[PDB]
RNA sequence: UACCUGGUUGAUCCUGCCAGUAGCAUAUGCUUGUCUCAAAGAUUAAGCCAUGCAUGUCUAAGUACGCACGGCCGGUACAGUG
């Protein structure tokens, strides 16, 4: 299941401004950046060993 | 600038101090037109304090769902300033 689908959003409607919806930033979410950081942490050990 | 002078006697030569002389640093008195520097509640009380200020800090890079502002899609995690 996808977490990004099930985020609880907040409606936000002030007088004189268009209606809006806001959702929080998901924390502890596996993203390609996290995997790439782990990949480089692994890849530095190979350089040290060589 | 390696310097002296007056004072004890009726008069003289001495010892010997007092006073006289020139710097310096604290206060004080009188006086004071122009410019450059410049010390400044140490001395008696490390005695007592009204009031105000004198230590705070964010980058692309720890944590933003404060519309407090703000552009597009509009479930389509999180645009950006903060
Ligand atoms: Mg995280
Ligand atoms: Mg005489
Ligand atoms: Mg003298
Ligand atoms: Mg003039
Ligand atoms: Mg004092
Ligand atoms: Mg004192
Ligand atoms: Mg002082
Ligand atoms: Mg100070």
Curated annotation (Swiss-Prot):
It is found in: Cytoplasm; Nucleus, Nucleolus. Ribosomal protein S6 is the major substrate of protein kinases in eukaryote ribosomes. The phosphorylation is stimulated by growth factors, tumor promoting agents, and mitogens. It is dephosphorylated at growth arrest. Component of the small ribosomal subunit. Part of the small subunit (SSU) processome, composed of more than 70 proteins and the RNA chaperone small nucleolar RNA (snoRNA) U3. Belongs to the eukaryotic ribosomal protein eS6 family. Component of the 40S small ribosomal subunit. Plays an important role in controlling cell growth and proliferation through the selective translation of particular classes of mRNA. Part of the small subunit (SSU) processome, first precursor of the small eukaryotic ribosomal subunit. This is Small ribosomal subunit protein eS6. It comes from Homo sapiens (Human). The gene is RPS6. The chain holds residues 151 to 200 of 249 of the full protein.
